[PDB]
Design a binder for these strands. Structure first.
Ligand SMILES: [Ca+2]
Ligand code: NA
Ligand code: NA
Length: 316
DNA sequence: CGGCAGTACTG
DNA sequence: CAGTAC
DNA sequence: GCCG
């Protein structure tokens, strides 16, 4: 696996500092570089050998900094606000600009957020389940959640099928997220069961809190009935059968996977989002793009000129 | 240099 | 409009 | 942050 973890560690700390400080691109380059250093077959030996890794000049300059020295000195200049901002980012619905606001307001602890800090409804639901949301769950409990949502959905219409796309479907032992995709094979009967099932599950108590409540997209908190059960974040999306193959890809993950798939689709003049695979829109543009039917996940790998990758092989 | 995904919700 | 989310 |  990671043959250069002594450097990937210190760089993941640097990338975290950038991610916590609004520099999404600095963090994205760092993460793509750690994801490349962790997947490389042999450990690094020189600067030349480091830069040839698809790693730049200043990144391999840090690789060589940790290869010749034992501690990267960039880390010594990291701002002391980085931990506080990261802590505020650990709250749901709270990112770099809200952590920055809380920080300049003199807040330096979660208790300060729960006492004097102004919170939104979502930032409150995140602040109350702070520990649970950071404790990823075993695959078995995610399966319990999946089957529970599927059974309750099938009671409204037995034709409906469900799938727990996400790190679970990728085969990851832990999952601090549960995204259940529900659809109907005909693509027309699905319309109208979202609210009924959502109220059903909240009535029984499967759902504890609600975050983003849209017509087609549900985001909230669930908790399996039983002792010592921690609150897990669940999303329930009811998209038509036509778009199911384009949705199941994105909601399977990872993000970096759908980022490389989106780049590859863009080079071949195609837009690959979580709703449909369309080709290049007319060009300022003088027209939208043309949808390409892709019923199965292989059809999407096909129209993109790529071999089918198993969900297990989607960490990119 | 300049692009790195586009989207819906919430406020 | 922006912020945070997938 | 890297790379076309
Ligand atoms: Ca996830
Ligand atoms: Na966060
Ligand atoms: Na339980």
């Amino acid at each position: 696996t990671n043959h250069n973890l002594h450097i990937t560690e210190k760089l993941e700390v640097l990338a975290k500092a950038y991610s916590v400080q609004g520099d999404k691109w600095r963090a994205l380059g760092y993460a793509k570089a750690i994801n490349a250093l962790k997947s490389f077959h042999k450990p690094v030996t020189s600067y030349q050998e480091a830069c040839s890794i698809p790693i730049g000049k200043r990144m391999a300059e840090k690789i060589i900094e940790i290869l010749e020295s034992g501690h990267l000195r960039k880390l010594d200049h990291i701002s002391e606000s980085v931990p506080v901002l990261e802590l505020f980012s650990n709250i749901w619905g709270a990112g770099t600009k809200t952590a920055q606001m809380w920080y300049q307001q003199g807040f330096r602890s979660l208790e300060d957020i729960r006492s004097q800090a102004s919170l939104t409804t979502q930032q409150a639901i995140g602040l109350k389940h702070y520990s649970d949301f950071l404790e990823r769950m075993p695959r078995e409990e995610a399966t319990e959640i999946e089957q529970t949502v599927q059974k309750a959905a099938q009671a409204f219409n037995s034709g409906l099928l469900c799938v727990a796309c996400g790190s679970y479907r990728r085969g990851k032992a832990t999952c601090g997220d549960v995204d259940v995709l529900i659809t109907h094979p005909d693509g027309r009967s699905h319309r109208g069961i979202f609210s009924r099932l959502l109220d059903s599950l909240r009535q029984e108590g499967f759902l504890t809190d609600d975050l983003v409540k849209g017509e087609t997209k549900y985001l909230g908190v669930c908790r399996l009935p039983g002792p010592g059960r921690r609150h897990r974040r669940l999303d329930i999306r009811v998209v038509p059968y036509s778009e199911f193959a384009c949705a199941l890809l994105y909601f399977t993950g990872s993000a970096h996977f759908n980022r490389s798939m989106r780049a590859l689709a863009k080079t071949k003049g195609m837009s690959l989002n979580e709703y449909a695979l369309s080709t290049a829109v007319v060009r300022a543009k003088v027209g939208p793009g043309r949808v390409l039917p892709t019923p199965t996940e292989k059809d999407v790998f096909r129209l993109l000129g790529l071999p089918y990758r198993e969900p297990a092989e989607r960490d990119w």
